[model samples]
Target: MMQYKLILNGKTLKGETTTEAVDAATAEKVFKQYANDNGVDGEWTYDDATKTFTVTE
Candidate 1:
């Protein structure tokens, strides 16, 4: 398992998730679904260097 950070705009939100998936692609899909369910909108990007998912609104 691994922890991933979620950022909104330029700052990190109180959101993060742990996943057992071995790849960023699967993690991204999981994250996106959460975002959609929560009605979050913006440009989504996965940063490898930081292991963070950013949503730019």
Candidate 2:
């Protein structure tokens, strides 16, 4: 598992996670869940080798 640090809602949210299966399309699905659940604005990039989602500020 990999953790990424990011800023959202003027607060820092750290170490959020996504599945290893996540691709660009599937990653959006996970992002929507996180944003809706956390009520925080977020974005993700696909890292192919690790098959992980990296959240960035």
Candidate 3:
């Protein structure tokens, strides 16, 4: 497994997680759903170098 970080508005959500995934696409999709479930509205971005997803509104 690999670590996938999610940042909202340049900051990481407290008490959340660094989700684990096997691939970048899956990571992005997972984070997107997480954001939607949590009422987080923003744009999604994936970083290959950091293996992270960013959400900005």
Number of colliding residue pairs in each model: 0, 0, 0
Superposed on all Cα atoms, model 1 deviates from the true structure by an RMSD in Å of 3.6
The candidate that wins on TM-score is 1
Report the C-alpha lDDT of model 1 over 12-50, residue by residue, as the tens digit: 446455557768678678777777776677778766676
As a whole number from 0 to 100, the lDDT of residue 29 in candidate 1 is: 81
Assess candidate 2 and give its lDDT. Answer: 0.51
The parts of candidate 3 lying over 4 Å away from their true place are: 1-5, 9-13, 46-51
Residue pairs in steric clash, candidate 2? Answer: none
Q: Rate the local accuracy (lDDT) of all candidates.
A: 0.64, 0.51, 0.65
Q: On residues 8-50, what C-alpha lDDT tens digit does candidate 3 reach at each position?
A: 5534455447656777677667778887877788777667688
Model 3, residue 13: distance off in Å is 6.2
Q: Which 10-residue window in model 1 sums to the lowest lDDT?
A: 1-10
- Off by more than 4 A, model 1: 1-3, 7-13
Best by lDDT: 3
Per-residue error at 7 for model 1, in Å?
Answer: 4.4
